[PDB]
Write a protein that binds this DNA or RNA. Sequence first.
RNA 1: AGCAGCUUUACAGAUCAAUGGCGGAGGAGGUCAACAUCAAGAACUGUGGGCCUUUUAUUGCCUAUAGAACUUAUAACGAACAUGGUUCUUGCCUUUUACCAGAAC
Lengths: 91, 167, 87, 48, 64, 96
Amino acid sequence: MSYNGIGLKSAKGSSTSGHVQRSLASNRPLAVQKQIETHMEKREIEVQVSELRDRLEEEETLSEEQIDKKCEALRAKLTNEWQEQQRMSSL
Amino acid sequence: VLQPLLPRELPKLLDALNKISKYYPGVIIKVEESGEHVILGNGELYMDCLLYDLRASYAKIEIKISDPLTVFSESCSNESFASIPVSNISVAAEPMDSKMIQDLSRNTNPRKLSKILRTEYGWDSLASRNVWSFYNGNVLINDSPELLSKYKEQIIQGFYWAVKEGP
Amino acid sequence: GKALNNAIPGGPKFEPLYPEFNSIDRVIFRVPIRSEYKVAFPHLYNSRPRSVRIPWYNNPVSCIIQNDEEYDTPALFFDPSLNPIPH
Amino acid sequence: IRACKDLKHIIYYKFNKNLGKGPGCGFWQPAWRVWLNFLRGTIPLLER
Amino acid sequence: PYLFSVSEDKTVKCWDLEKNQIIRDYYGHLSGVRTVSIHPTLDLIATAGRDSVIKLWDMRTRIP
Amino acid sequence: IESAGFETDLRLSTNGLGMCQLYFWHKIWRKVPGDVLDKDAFIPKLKPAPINSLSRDFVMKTRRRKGISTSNDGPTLEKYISAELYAQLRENGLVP
RNA sequence: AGCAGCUUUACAGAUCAAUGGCGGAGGAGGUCAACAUCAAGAACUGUGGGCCUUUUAUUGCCUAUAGAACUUAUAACGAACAUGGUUCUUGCCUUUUACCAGAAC
Ligand SMILES: O=P(O)(O)O[C@H]1[C@H](OP(=O)(O)O)[C@@H](OP(=O)(O)O)[C@H](OP(=O)(O)O)[C@@H](OP(=O)(O)O)[C@H]1OP(=O)(O)O
């Protein structure tokens, strides 16, 4: 009977004792990254607009239309500041 | 992983697996795309018991089985280096925060959810609003809204297909 | 062991009762499947467990404290082996 | 005969633990049982 | 559920058809057995051959 | 993946004076050592792979088990993105 | 403990007709014997009622009720343990017996 897959099925018919011994002898910023950076910069503007929206909605004081108007105004302001900064940096 | 010893007996195995799937609630049995059957169980004794039931009572056929394996999962350890689009719609990914992984693993309205995310997880204002779905420990974030909202359902479905069979 | 033609240490040996899948390039080798595992969980660790009889799983760990050693030690005593109850 | 040889081995090594080699082990009960069981099966054979 | 077979080797054998194995052997014919007939209402079999005699065997004990 | 026969080894080593229970009610998922993209990781044919090769070994053995790979043909971004873009990514030092 | 109730196998006193209650008209053993029974739908008989079978003799099922000794769940009278036959597959072999050692009946 084998042990850990090693031995004979049986010693009978092998002409040997079947004794098994373990062998002691064996032992340029890729355009896609610039695209992600530009996306993150524009995202910061949209994040500011969304935060303003969150504040106005939580105050439950303004109608959804007035909140949309204030968000569009803030978006336009921040987008203009960003375009001016990009023009200045590229300059 | 298992398969019948004799292919002629595959339908008997199918019937037996259905019985097992019903009698062993916690077992998950799924046929893989290669045609081999996968059995997921709680441990070595659980498997030994269900395999005895297959061989001795439900299937009564001989079944070849693999050595024990485990269910792996695919993840990312850093943010995506580039916004690469695909064609045949660019998507990015990041390592989810430990705290949210743990709470989702324990299963713990849009404005309420945005409060949860902003106060305990510190997500920004947009992320806390644009979450489209939570599935198997993963999150899809949408960040003109009308331009995208046309196919929200189909995008979510694609995400559901991706999260259950990674690259 | 007899049915599986597997001989555990110190156990009896017998004649064998019986004369793409699992290829080494597809198998994850983490721990060798010991023969003891093949008798411990004979349905899980064998592909053809014919004539196998499922064994008794286990018995609660024994905690019988021994005595009759010192003539005057009582039947009930807090043996040195026991953890104290420090609450 | 083999069973008795095997019993002698386990018996003697239990018996001789701090005594060494030499006669003196008289624990014949196990080998005696072996021969009684041999007779149990030899009886019908020899009767026939 | 039995099959009876006879051969030139002088043997008469009963096969258990639930196992497809020989279970009973009827010894006694001096030479090759040519024919066998099962009794319709008794647990008996008739066999005959070159020894010019008919042997009637009780199925259970195998006694002629 | 390392738990096979753990209970048997424990019970035998302690001569029955020790018992164990293994469970997964706390869904702990841990990073397998090594890198998945290390296509040069050494992997013994029969013995357990070295620590740093585990992620590669487990991925490749899984792919071959599922028939996703014929070999060292493992996962790469080139299978989904266009060939000419990957040719650039490999020269930029992102992924060879 | 004292007091109270219920109960009566005993003792005493009173009573002692009938009726009722209660109890009764061998025991322990035997390296004695005979007979019966002991491995199965977890798997037992009888009495009573219904249906079927049976054809004067009883079987099976359902239902009601009474009893179920011994043996058995990491299954079995035996906390133990021999041999033989047939068949198959092996061993040593030089043919049989006698044998090797696994299986099945
Ligand atoms: O041949 P050894 O290896 O030296 O063993 C011998 C041998 O026993 P076995 O050969 O059967 O193992 C003797 O038996 P015999 O040669 O006489 O048949 C036995 O003596 P007994 O006659 O009393 O059986 C003796 O026992 P002792 O220990 O008393 O010397 C025992 O020695 P060890 O087994 O201890 O080596």
